[PDB]
């Protein structure tokens, strides 16, 4: 239940949420409709939890990579702008919010990571990752360090892992191939091995997080950091004479960051869909709208043609685009959650020494590619064909033919008109279920299976 007659918006704490709230005061002044902008932590996780139920915010802001995942779960309303409004944003930002032909969010801006550096401590930043160790040794002797950045989020280490051949999902023949993950190839190993060595050799600390790295850089304690445009604002405020530049190379190869499009989706269950559409279309994605948010935290390259024209003239925005050109735009597929979770674990376990690189990236391999699920599926496929073999052997135009459905339940050859029941699945997509209860499917009088399967009785097994 969302309160009808208001707008509740969720956006991440590192973005210009105060700028956004002022745009909210513009709307309210004009229409009399209150706009509440909130920044809950774990935003990208807390959403599908609430939105699933029919609750949460009217609008959500996050990079497009997680939006496939919401659309599949059916939590995003289908946005409906016309030709005239789409001609005002760049076509490639529209690609990022298209899942299965449908636009599911408004693109706001393009984010890419850059190398930010202190010009006073380092007038000439390193062009290669490999010279950073020596550079840290010199800086240590002055009671500083070379490089601090967030080691807790795979987003910041990915550029280095991708550099020499690391990838998420293979892109072939139009589609992303969810069964071909490149998190365990020689390139990924080499990039991750390099990061882990910086830590063993005490050029970095495995605990270092977003706030540790930001504060150190803005106090002048470290020469370099890795971050995006939202961070520039805090550096302006600080003493620091900073430059924003292209990322270092690894094995002569450019670092390949994942490029995200900040996006505004609309909660499917909200009764305020049109109000939200009028706020995003007529208030936020205007120059006045975007400027208000940007003058709080920079957005990067915005999705609006009329405002980027100006913004493109900033050399910091040039650098953001240079790095963007060298990376990939993120896939928006639902398997992105699982990939990110997998790589987050690898980097942390590898960094802490809990696991070696080889061990770590293989687990991530198996997790990202859902190989346990793919193995179990092969077993169920085989079992289901056999049960059909057994029956045919023991043996007319009136049966429903055997199927294996998306959950792994084998529906046997059945009589027209039969209500069939089968044990709930023993395992499904990470979760175990009480198999003492059944699912139910009707074989219709016409010899075709009913389209819908009753899975209502299948309950998970959890704590105690």
């Amino acid at each position: 239940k969302i309160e009808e007659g208001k707008l509740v918006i969720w956006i991440n704490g590192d973005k210009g949420y105060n700028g956004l709230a002022e745009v909210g005061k513009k709307f309210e002044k004009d229409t009399g409709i209150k706009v509440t902008v909130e920044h809950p932590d774990k935003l990208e996780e807390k959403f599908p939890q609430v939105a699933a139920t029919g609750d949460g915010p009217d609008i959500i802001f996050w990079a497009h990579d997680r939006f496939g995942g919401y659309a599949q779960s059916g939590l995003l309303a289908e946005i409906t702008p016309d030709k005239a409004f789409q001609d005002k944003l760049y076509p490639f930002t529209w690609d990022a919010v298209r899942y299965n032909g449908k636009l599911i969010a408004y693109p706001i801006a393009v984010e890419a990571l850059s190398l930010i550096y202190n010009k006073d401590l380092l007038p000439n930043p390193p062009k290669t990752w490999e010279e950073i160790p020596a550079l840290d040794k010199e800086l240590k002797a002055k009671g500083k360090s070379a490089l601090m950045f967030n080691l807790q989020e795979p987003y910041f280490t990915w550029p280095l892992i991708a550099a020499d051949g690391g990838y998420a999902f293979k892109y072939e023949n139009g589609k992303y191939d969810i069964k071909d993950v490149g998190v365990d190839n020689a390139g990924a190993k080499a990039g991750l091995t390099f990061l882990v060595d910086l830590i063993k050799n005490k050029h970095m600390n495995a605990d270092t997080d977003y706030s540790i790295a930001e504060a150190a850089f803005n106090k002048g304690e470290t020469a370099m950091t890795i971050n995006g445009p939202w961070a520039w604002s805090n550096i302006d405020t600080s003493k620091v004479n900073y430059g924003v530049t292209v990322l270092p190379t690894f094995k002569g190869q450019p670092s390949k960051p994942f490029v995200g499009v900040l996006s505004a989706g609309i909660n499917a269950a909200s009764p305020n869909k049109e109000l939200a559409k009028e706020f995003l279309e007529n208030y936020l994605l205007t120059d006045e709208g975007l400027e208000a948010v940007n003058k709080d935290k920079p957005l990067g390259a915005v999705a609006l043609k009329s405002y980027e024209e100006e913004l493109a003239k900033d050399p910091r925005i040039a650098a953001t685009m240079e790095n963007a050109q060298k990376g990939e735009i993120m896939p928006n597929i639902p398997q992105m959650s699982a990939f990110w979770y997998a790589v987050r674990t690898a980097v942390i376990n590898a960094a802490s020494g809990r696991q070696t690189v080889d061990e770590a990236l293989k687990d991530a391999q198996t997790n990202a590619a859902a190989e346990f699920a793919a193995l179990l599926h092969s077993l169920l496929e085989a079992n289901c064909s056999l049960a059909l073999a057994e029956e045919l052997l023991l043996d007319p135009y009136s049966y429903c033919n055997t199927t294996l459905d998306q959950i792994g339940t084998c529906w046997p050859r059945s009589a027209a008109g039969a209500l069939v029941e089968r044990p709930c699945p023993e395992y499904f997509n990470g979760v175990k279920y009480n198999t003492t209860r059944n699912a139910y499917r009707e074989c219709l009088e016409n010899g075709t299976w009913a389209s819908k399967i009753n899975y209502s009785q299948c309950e998970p097994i959890l704590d105690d």
Binding site: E45, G74, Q406, I407, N429, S456, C458, L462
Partner: peptide
């Protein structure tokens, strides 16, 4: 964690 996982499946199960 596994509560959000169960919740994701439940919604897929409801649709299917």
């Amino acid at each position: 964690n596994l509560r959000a996982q169960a919740a994701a499946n439940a919604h897929l199960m409801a649709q299917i």
